[PDB]
Write a protein that binds this ligand. Structure first.
Ligand SMILES: [Mn+2]
Ligand SMILES: [Mn+2]
Ligand SMILES: [Mn+2]
Ligand SMILES: [Mn+2]
Ligand SMILES: [Mn+2]
Ligand SMILES: [Mn+2]
Lengths: 163, 163
DNA sequence: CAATCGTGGGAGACTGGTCTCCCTGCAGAT
DNA sequence: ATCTGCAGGGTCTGGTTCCAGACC
DNA sequence: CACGATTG
């Protein structure tokens, strides 16, 4: 029936799949805030929970979320942000009725044959264009790869297959 | 007269002050999980949300939460954790109807004159024992300093004063 | 606005300065 | 079960008993 | 991935 997918980073997205094969994809809401006298983007907690409140996806729907796995060479702020986005999303999903399943990036990439691309984000939008043709206008820009990975997470949880 | 205080780390706690001067304090729920073939503690998302929903504090009650401020010398896992813990609590508090006010640790310590101690954990427990003498039996171990800081955070928000 | 690049970084409270503040993760001692 | 000491750290998944190769 | 930056 219903499946949710969540790419939790700042330019990520949430995707909702209906039993009737239709789909929705939403950019992660954010706000600009002051930290250490500079501007920083940060996920908008209250918009997120409101967004999840207005989904038609019923309670107990599974949400597939990408596991945070920051690289050891990433700085400590990157580690903080991936940690923070993960917790903010997971708690929002659990608080809104949804059962949360963390999926590693290698898993859903392996399942759609996306391993070791020269241009991994481009391929993601292509694969997601093919699984969700009606979302093809929403995947034209390079910054739309977050919408694609949300869709691909949901498509993975749903068990969809590429042609 | 209702105030919540949250110390968000893994040994932290949530303190709830009612308008009749009574007070509760609960340790942060956590679970043991496997990460890279060792065991770790992580906050327990379902249990925190169930606990927030059990509170009689009405909607819009302000929750004072200690701002995450990890040191540049702390490891990247330190930053991840405090990031994760902070977003999980913030999201959990907002979804449960409470207003979230981040408070720097320098603010509530200066408010109580705790700044610049050689035994800052002991002092917090001593100060919370005085503000909340019925919590004295619950503050006699050193590991209880998380209860102390949550109690003191809530005491900051409510405007209490040491005698 | 949309994209590309290179490196991995504190933050906060009372006209920049000064100063003080949190942890995690793992081992070892009782 | 409680405390202390000290340095600041990847994690995951197919494939086993430890690796190889991959990923944000 | 994040964070500052600079590119049309
Ligand atoms: Mn991602
Ligand atoms: Mn991106
Ligand atoms: Mn992404
Ligand atoms: Mn604290
Ligand atoms: Mn402690
Ligand atoms: Mn604490």
């Amino acid at each position: 029936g219903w499946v949710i997918g969540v790419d939790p980073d700042i330019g990520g997205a949430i995707a909702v799949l209906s039993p009737d094969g239709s789909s929705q994809v939403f950019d992660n809401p954010f706000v600009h805030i002051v930290v250490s006298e500079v501007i920083r983007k940060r996920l908008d907690t209250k918009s997120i929970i409101q967004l999840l409140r207005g989904l038609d996806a019923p309670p107990g729907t599974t949400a597939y979320i990408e596991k945070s796995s920051p690289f050891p060479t990433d700085g400590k702020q990157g580690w903080w942000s991936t940690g923070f986005s993960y917790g903010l999303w997971i708690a929002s999903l659990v608080a809104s009725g949804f059962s949360v399943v963390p999926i590693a990036s290698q898993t859903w990439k392996a399942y759609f044959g996306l391993m070791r691309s020269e241009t991994p984000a481009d391929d993601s939008r292509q694969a997601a264009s093919i699984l969700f043709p009606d979302k093809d206008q929403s995947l034209k820009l390079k910054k739309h790869h977050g919408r694609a990975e949300a869709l691909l997470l949901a498509a993975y949880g749903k068990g969809l297959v590429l042609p």
